[PDB]
Paper text:
In the heterocystous cyanobacterium Nostoc sp. PCC 7120, one such strategy is the use of an ArsR-SmtB transcriptional regulator RexT that senses H2O2 and upregulates expression of thioredoxin to maintain cellular redox homeostasis. Different from many other members of the ArsR-SmtB family which bind metal ions, RexT has been proposed to use disulfide bond formation as a trigger to bind and release DNA. Here, we present high-resolution crystal structures of RexT in the reduced and H2O2-treated states. These structures reveal that RexT showcases the ArsR-SmtB winged-helix-turn-helix fold and forms a vicinal disulfide bond to orchestrate a response to H2O2. Each protomer of RexT has an α1-α2-α3-α4-β1-β2-α5a/b architecture.
Residue numbers in the entry:
A (entry chain B): 1 to 105
B (entry chain A): -1 to 102
Write the structure that this text describes.
Amino acid sequence: MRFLYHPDRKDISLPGVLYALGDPARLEIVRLLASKGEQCCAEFDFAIAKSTMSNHFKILRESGVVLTRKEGTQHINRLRREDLETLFPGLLDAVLRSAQPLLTC
Amino acid sequence: GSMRFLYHPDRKDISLPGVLYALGDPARLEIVRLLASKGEQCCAEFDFAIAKSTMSNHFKILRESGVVLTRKEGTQHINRLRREDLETLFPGLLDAVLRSAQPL
Ligand SMILES: [Cl-]
Ligand SMILES: [Cl-]
Ligand SMILES: [Cl-]
């Protein structure tokens, strides 16, 4: 599988994770990946410029939140739930409890 | 005994992404961690950057995002965690963040 860049768990920090979630578009991506499982980039039809969405997914990958792979021409994103729960127990649940939907609303 | 606070948003204007962005920095997370365990703290206690303009910007972000109040008292600026606002809006968030925050 063509996995895109992603850090090893050891190089994932709490400030980086909080930073990655610190954006309405990125929070909404994480919220949908958590509830619906893996989703290609094109499912996140935000009213947002192409280069900006690309930077968003780079931020999510560099921070250790999302694992992306190329399948065909799709970029398939996966929430790194197991890594995040191992490092930061209960963090995802506390964030997702309060995250307000955007794309489904 | 001053209740003279710098600009802070109303509870209704605090958003979860804005709060997470404010915590999403080693200096700012440590400020929040210290306010949470030690109580109110003067700005001069937080020597977490080479430049004073960098610390000023950290506190500006903490105040504008709804995490921190800043009180002007004499010559000092005293910071206070907005525990009630944050816990009412984002139940369990502060605990989850603080449980994993590592001392800087
Ligand atoms: Cl795609
Ligand atoms: Cl306001
Ligand atoms: Cl001060």
